[PDB]
Amino acid sequence: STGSATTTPIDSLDDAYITPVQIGTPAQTLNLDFDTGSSDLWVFSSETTASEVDGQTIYTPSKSTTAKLLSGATWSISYGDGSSSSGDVYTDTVSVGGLTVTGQAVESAKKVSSSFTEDSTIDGLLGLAFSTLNTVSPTQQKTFFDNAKASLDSPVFTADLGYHAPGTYNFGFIDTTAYTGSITYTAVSTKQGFWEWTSTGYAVGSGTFKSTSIDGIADTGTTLLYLPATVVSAYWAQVSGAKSSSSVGGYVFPCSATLPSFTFGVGSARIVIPGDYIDFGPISTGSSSCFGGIQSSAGIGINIFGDVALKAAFVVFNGATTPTLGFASK
Ligand SMILES: C[C@@H](NCCCF)c1cccc(-n2ccnc2)c1
Ligand SMILES: C[C@H](NCCCF)c1cccc(-n2ccnc2)c1
């Protein structure tokens, strides 16, 4: 089997991407944030505290003839940005782009933090990291990808995120028309439950490539590119007037600037992030201070190849017995 779904930026900055997901019988379509940095499929629901729902589409398990309470199971998750949600668990039929899994754990939110409420465009998350990170207790549950894997033509999914445009998530096949050149594959460690890999270095603009190992994660659910402070300082030193602002919480730069590109290594290959991808616009409405798309990971404890990096590439999440990542230009 295969599936193919379009993923669409939630706003003009590509702060996140939503992908329609069918849940239940008859289908209830929710727009989920596909997140290769977590392993829970959780949704706004008929059980979510009413004051915490503000425009989201909800899953109502009582209207699904295939929904079953997973008795005793609860979930609770905290994200790197301080946001959180928790609740109980149903199994139900879940379809993405034509690919159907029966008996998928659908985690129904009873509570969500203010940030989730305030984002009307995101009806929940669909985790695509390793199932070892799934938060369901007392019986850990499998991701949608892990449940689909055995049925897929090839045990893979691909992320093809757009810059200020729709893109695609494919399951079970590699669309050879969606990238240029060849796919370079690189080793993955699953020890922390992430798609964790080692970049071979970087360049800033037309500068010379610096060979240096940068361990980090391929994370579609993180907006920005978080790298070591040395690398980030080297980038922003090429932008007149850029500075790290403690008050704003990262590197800012004059909105009048034209940003240099950023290149990262994948083995002997190179992925070039155009400068415009690194512009996240005014810090506050009408400001001439703009927020940078490359930020320090020093305060996180991991480097994160988020959307800024991944949307410059066609990315293969290879879930073969030994997982690997693939990157191609596009
Ligand atoms: C509440 C929500 N806001 C996202 C706003 C733009 F998208 C949030 C805050 C912190 C982290 C995350 N997150 C989700 C998966 N990985 C990380 C989401
Ligand atoms: C939503 C966005 N960048 C992507 C989300 C961070 F992963 C942005 C645009 C303008 C300003 C900020 N900002 C201000 C203080 N800290 C952050 C963030």
Which domains does the chain carry? 5-174 (2.40.70.10), 175-330 (2.40.70.10)
CB 27 within 8 A of CB 67: no
Cα(87) to centroid of ligand 2, in Å? 28
Q: Report how this structure was experimentally obtained.
A: X-ray
CB 25 within 8 A of CB 120: no
Which residue in 154, 143, 107, 132 sits closest to 34, CA to CA?
143
Distance CA 212, CA 204 (A): 14
Distance CA 93, CA 330 (A): 34
Atom of ligand 1 nearest to the CA of 80: 11
Give the tokens for residue 312. 């410059």
Atom 10 in ligand 2: which residue has the minimum CA distance? 283
Distance CA 276, CA 260 (A): 8
| Alpha carbon separation from 218 to 37, 199, 325 (Å, rounded) | 7, 11, 9
Q: Decide if 35 is catalytic.
A: yes
CB 205 within 8 A of CB 238: yes
Q: Catalytic residue, from 14, 33, 35, 160: name it.
A: 35
Distance CA 36, CA 130 (A): 8
Distance CA 2, CA 135 (A): 27
Cα(316) to centroid of ligand 1, in Å? 23
Distance CA 183, CA 193 (A): 23
Q: Decide if 279 is catalytic.
A: no
**Residue 50 gets which letter from DSSP?**
G
Distance CA 213, CA 111 (A): 40
Which residue in 153, 139, 18 sits closest to 88, CA to CA?
139
Atom of ligand 2 nearest to the CA of 282: 10
**Residue 261 gets which letter from DSSP?**
P
Instruction: Give phi and psi for 310, each to the nearest 5.
Output: -70, -30
Q: Resolution of this PDB entry, in A? A: 1.2
Distance CA 145, CA 156 (A): 8
Which residue in 209, 213, 291 sits closest to 247, CA to CA?
291
Give the tokens for residue 190. 């699953």
Which residue in 76, 329, 20 sits closest to 182, CA to CA?
329
- Judge if the beta carbon of residue 223 lies within 6 A of ligand 2: yes
Distance CA 22, CA 131 (A): 21
CB 160 within 8 A of CB 330: yes
Cα(320) to centroid of ligand 2, in Å? 35
At residue 277, what is the residue type?
A: Y
Give the strand pairing for 294-296 and 225-227: parallel
- Judge if the beta carbon of residue 220 lies within 6 A of ligand 1: no
Cβ neighbors of 127 (< 8 A, separation 6 or more) are 35, 38, 39, 40, 41, 133, 134, 143, 144
Atom 1 in ligand 2: which residue has the minimum CA distance? 15
Q: Is the peptide bond before 282 cis (omega within 30 degrees of 0)?
A: no
Give the strand pairing for 269-273 and 324-328: unpaired
| Alpha carbon separation from 158 to 171, 289, 314, 326 (Å, rounded) | 7, 35, 7, 9
Cβ neighbors of 330 (< 8 A, separation 6 or more) are 160, 178, 179, 180, 313, 314
CB 184 within 8 A of CB 266: yes
Cβ neighbors of 47 (< 8 A, separation 6 or more) are 87, 88, 108, 109, 110
**Residue 256 gets which letter from DSSP?**
T
Q: Where are the alpha helices (DSSP H) in the chain?
A: 114-117, 144-148, 229-236, 307-310
Using CA atoms of 42, 38, 73, 55 in order, give the dihedral in degrees to the nearest 10: -20
At residue 246, what is the residue type?
A: S
Residue of 247, 283, 307 best suited for mutating to test ligand 2, as the one with most atoms within 8 Å of CB: 283
Q: Residues 30-42, buried b or exposed e (16+ Cβ, 10 A)?
A: bbbbbbbbbbbbb
Give the tokens for residue 303. 């480097």
Distance CA 266, CA 263 (A): 10
